[PDB]
RNA sequence: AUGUAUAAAAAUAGAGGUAGGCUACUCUCCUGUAUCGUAGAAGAUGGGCGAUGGUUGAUGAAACGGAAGUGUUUUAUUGACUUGUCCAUGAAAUUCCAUGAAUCCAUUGCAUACGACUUUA
RNA sequence: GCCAAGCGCGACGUUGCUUCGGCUCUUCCUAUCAUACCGAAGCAGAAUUCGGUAAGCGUUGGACCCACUAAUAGGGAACGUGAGCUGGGACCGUCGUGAGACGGUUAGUCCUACUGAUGAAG
RNA sequence: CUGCCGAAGUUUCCGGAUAGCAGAAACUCAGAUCAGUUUUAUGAGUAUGUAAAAUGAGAGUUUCUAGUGGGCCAUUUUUGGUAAGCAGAACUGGCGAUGCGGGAUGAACCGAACGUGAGGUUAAGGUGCCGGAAUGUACGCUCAUCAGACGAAAAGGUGUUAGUUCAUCUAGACAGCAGGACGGUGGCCAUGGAAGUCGGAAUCCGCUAAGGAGUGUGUAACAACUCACCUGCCGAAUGAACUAGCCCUGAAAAUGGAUGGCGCUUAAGCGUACUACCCAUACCUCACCGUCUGGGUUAGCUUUGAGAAGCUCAGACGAGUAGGCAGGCGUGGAGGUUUGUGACGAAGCCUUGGGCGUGAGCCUGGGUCGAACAGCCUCUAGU
RNA sequence: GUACGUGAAAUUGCUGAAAGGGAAGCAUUGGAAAUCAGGUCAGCAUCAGUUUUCGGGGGCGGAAAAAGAAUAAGGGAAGGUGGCUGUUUAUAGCCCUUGUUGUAAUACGUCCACUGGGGACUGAGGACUGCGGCUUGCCAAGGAUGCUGACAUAAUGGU
């Protein structure tokens, strides 16, 4: 089927925390 | 989905909906009132054919604030006739050369409700013309685009 | 598809300078609202020519001189990366030079996947002796005995009848 | 192109996908479609690739009755019926009505031994694939897997190339007096300006 | 359904032959837009000329097909048709598209919550 | 701290002493105790030690032990399995200094999987 | 039942007022004033504030009367930070009162804002099949025994592809064969001993084409082998360090499972370019409904079309919570009226009968039924 | 028929018709079957409105395209041909410049109040006015007519 041990499309609460995680990489490097 | 700016911008250039169109007179007020709403409309210099067939086919007057077609040239006659426009020749003249009643001979046309352009857009409509785009101005590809929309 | 455009701009005369100096630059773009505004960001990037102050003076397409004969082009970019700082050399084989431009954007967007905007177009010229090649692939094309069969051949009227031949 | 009312379709040497692809538009569009040689199916990708992706499909079980679980068909006309059907909307009753015109076999059974056999270019591996690229035959992929009439397939086959072979001997020598008598006319070369 | 027309195999960095002695030949491929078939009041009625074939219907067969052989031939007849090449009649106003067993009732206990199961009659 | 490829930091190196808690049960994970097979080591042999593949199969009986044992490996089912199972008050009032007690209200909330059994019917 | 208008979503003072947003009433105003807008000029610090052309729109006030006084999400600036989160403001946005196309599915993403329809064309997203639409065109990259289609980070890989720099190269490039790889010297200490290679310090030298106080194996120690470096045969490119793309790694357990699926490998993956194509309630044209706005309409002209509460012409518009306004449908009873309906069948009821209205509802055929009931105008309510 | 006027719905049995692979109801579009009202439905032509899809011809523009071809000068050479690894058109040729044929062509861009076809949807209004064109009249000019068919013992429109 896939052969992968972890299914390749997350969900949306966790896509949606990504575009948070790359939130965080901006305060890291603007102002953190 | 629009700014507050852009939004009263575009009323006083009377693009109250999407695929309007309008003439303008090209000054420094002009230029940068279209630099802000520049990602909301596309903008170009019109040739003869693009001035004369909009007038001719889309032409409609504010007559009575009313939008009576440009059927007739008594209709031109009788709401611009005080400035010796007499005919859609006239009308088309005055447009085109940018006569000394540019002005009120502008804002007697309704704006221009032309259709989708047959043929469609480009793939990304929303990006500048410049990088593959739409929006923004176009140079003279805005008559490319008007014969589109007739 | 990209055209040549030779254009040529200077800031607008003022009292300072009466007779402003005149810049021409050959690049590439798809239509001449394309070149010109490439033209602008060149010249600021570089002279520090305001858009508003500079005013363009002469565009003209530029065409092949020699289209049907065959050439090789070497081209100086300076592409932009992650770390958005690189130059490159490239040698590309064809009539043209305004297709090795675009087989040059090609390839950039496909090996390093560099966008129009990031590329930046420093120099093209054309490698008119066969020594001055500098790539392999460009001196095997200019062997004199340069034969080989076609690669990449592959070949509605869905349901064939017969197998395809798919050789000679 | 053209249609035909049924469609026999050598599968030696196509892709699954490709093949089954064209197949289930075939079949909405009202067609009934026979695919022989379902064994000889090709796959791009190395068999142990291949092996794995089938070895995860099996892995698929409940644990109240596997009985409910997903049955897993070994033969290589499954596996092909497999990937037809998911190109299908099989749960509508058009879908369904689509399913049964396919019949997909191992070899050439009787009925359809005698019948001509029509490829699919979209879906043949040598138009497909670039040469060097790795690829596995379902027929070996399914003998691998479970499926256990491999040697009877090839030996039916065998057979049937065999006499296949005497009746085109048979026909070519046919074809060979008739293509000599044609010339014997003089019409074929009094009137050959329209090309005949 | 509207011709419900078409059976080699394998290769694709090669095949198939013809003509030869696994080796010397040359030719063909480059898809089926091919080949077969196709004139006739849904296909009428006769007459020639020239084949001496083709297409079949009904019998009589013998050989073949087992993977799902339900079809392939070879035929011995008989009945038709033949457009292979020419002729002569007929056609319409439809006067502008529409189409013998099992079961119950009994019996058994190798079986059994009840059905079922195994027996016997 | 010393260096310190490099881009004032500066990696690896180097110096400095210093309520919870457990029975049964079901499966599953491998981060494997045993069983099977390999690799390394002064591995002579034997008994080992360490490291790989590996969850197929096991991983007890009694009170820190104990003996058996090939071995008595670690975990999950986020309130593991308490709907398999068991063990180890608040408000108000009154008297009140630095301090604690003597109350009135109070407030809880078929269907289907599985196991077998028949069974009409192309 | 239908239609029309339609917020606030919170300041500013003490739960109330004021104001704001929405209407109504009554005024004055079109040689006038406005504006979620841009220029020009002045100064002052690319911005700022003040004043004076562009474009658009008829612009103003007074009374008085409803409803509202939350929040959530996101961008940017900034204030601190902390293993890491984040925390505090401001800012205007989006939701909120709002359907629709796409994103497999979705409060916050991409498009787009809504009367009933016909046609055309598009946005966003798409064109292998599910699925409407190119198994399109052109140029590349990628092979994963856990590909891809969407922090764990410092790095690792004899994985591939382009480059950048520096090196040698007919004085013969590497690589491979044939060799040399020496003499003082076993240089000096150390000990069963170490003769380059137990070890500790030196690291000199003559000869060359070149040979170290030795690259490792080896030796009890030599010896022997080896390379550092040279020589010959051979005949041309070769090596080192970096950059970038894609590929593997750069941990995570506990029934079977997900680029949505099937599947896809010169893609149906990734990047780019170019055409064509698919369809939204969006855009265009047209018809119709309604609302608003503007114009016209009496010696009532033989065009007869004056229920003036009527007729007619034209244009624009159509989501809608709180709220506001208007017009209608239906029921019991009352006054009036219809020369009203009715045992030749009232009312009621039933019905895959018909018709009208956007709708509330109304009319009617057939059946059953057996004594009363309805239209219109007004009144009334236990509607 | 006193389980007694009328006799609704829920619900139940029966007969008829149909549907039914782990829901059903509903909406849209039609088909089938049944049943209702009872002019209908077609084809073409000539026009109007909107629209889509193929062509043809002709202006103008740019390096007044670039090329190119043919034909005269000169220059250079190769990925070196004939010749003899090395050379300079010979028994192949190529590149560069200029002249010429020239006002070359063509592509691309743009325009035509230039033109020829194919397709689809729509037909609002209802004496005459108006703006125009051709010449009292006629007209593609303030919104569709004409010519035929077939079919009513059915098509259409329903339910």
Not at chain 3, 6 to 14: D, F, I, L, M, W
Not at chain 3, 91 to 106: I, N
Not at chain 4, 122 to 136: F, S
Request: proline share 5%.
């Amino acid at each position: 089927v896939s052969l992968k041990k972890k299914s390749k499309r997350r969900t949306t609460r966790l896509r949606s925390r990504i575009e948070k995680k790359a939130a965080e990489s901006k305060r890291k490097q603007k102002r953190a | 989905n629009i700014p507050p700016k852009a939004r009263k911008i575009m009323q006083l250039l009377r693009l109250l909906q999407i695929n309007n169109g309008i003439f303008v007179k090209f000054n420094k007020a002009i230029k940068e009132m279209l630099q802000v709403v520049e990602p909301y409309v596309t903008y170009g210099i019109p040739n003869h054919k693009t001035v004369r067939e909009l007038i001719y086919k889309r032409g409609f007057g504010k007559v009575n604030k009313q939008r009576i077609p440009l059927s007739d040239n008594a209709i031109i006659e009788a709401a611009l006739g005080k400035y010796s426009i007499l005919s859609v020749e006239d009308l088309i003249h005055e447009i085109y050369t940018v006569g000394p009643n540019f002005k009120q001979a502008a804002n007697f046309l309704w704006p221009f409700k032309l259709s989708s352009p047959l043929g469609g857009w480009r793939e990304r409509k929303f990006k500048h013309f410049i990088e593959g785009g739409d929006a923004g101005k176009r140079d003279e590809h805005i008559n490319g685009l008007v014969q589109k929309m007739l | 598809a990209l055209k040549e455009y030779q254009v040529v701009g200077r800031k607008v005369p003022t009292e300072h300078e009466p007779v402003p100096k005149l810049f021409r630059m050959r690049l590439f773009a798809p239509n001449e609202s394309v070149a010109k505004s490439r033209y602008w960001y060149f010249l600021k990037m570089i002279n520090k020519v305001k858009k508003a102050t500079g005013e363009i003076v002469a565009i003209n397409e530029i065409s092949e001189p020699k289209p049907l004969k065959a050439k090789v082009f070497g081209i100086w970019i300076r592409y932009d990366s992650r770390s958005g700082t690189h130059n490159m050399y490239k040698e590309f084989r064809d009539t043209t030079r305004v297709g090795a431009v675009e087989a040059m954007y090609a390839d950039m967007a496909a090996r390093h996947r560099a966008r129009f905007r990031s590329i930046r177009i420093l120099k093209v010229v054309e490698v008119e002796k066969k020594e001055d090649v500098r790539r392999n692939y460009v001196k095997q094309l200019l062997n004199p005995h340069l034969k080989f069969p076609l690669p990449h051949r592959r070949t509605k009227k869905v349901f064939a009848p017969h197998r395809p031949s798919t050789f000679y | 192109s053209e249609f035909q009312k049924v469609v026999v379709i050598d599968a030696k040497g196509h892709l699954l996908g490709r093949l089954a692809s064209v197949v289930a538009k075939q079949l909405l569009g009202g067609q009934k479609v026979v695919v022989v040689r379902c064994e000889e199916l090709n796959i791009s990708g190395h068999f142990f690739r291949n092996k794995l992706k089938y070895l995860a499909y099996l892995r698929k079980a409940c644990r109240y009755n596997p009985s409910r679980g997903a049955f897993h068909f070994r033969a290589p006309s499954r596996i092909f019926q497999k990937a037809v059907r998911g190109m299908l909307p099989h749960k509508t009753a058009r879908g369904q009505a689509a399913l049964e015109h396919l019949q997909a076999v191992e070899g050439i059974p009787p009925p359809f031994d005698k019948q001509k056999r029509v490829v699919v270019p979209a879906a043949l591996r040598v138009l497909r694939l670039k040469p060097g690229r790795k690829y596995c035959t379902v027929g070996r992929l399914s003998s691998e897997v479970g499926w256990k009439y491999n040697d009877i397939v090839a030996k039916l086959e065998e057979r049937r190339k065999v006499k296949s072979a005497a009746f085109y001997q048979a026909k070519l020598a046919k074809q060979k007096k008739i293509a000599s008598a044609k010339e014997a006319s003089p019409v074929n070369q009094k009137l050959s300006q329209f090309g005949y």
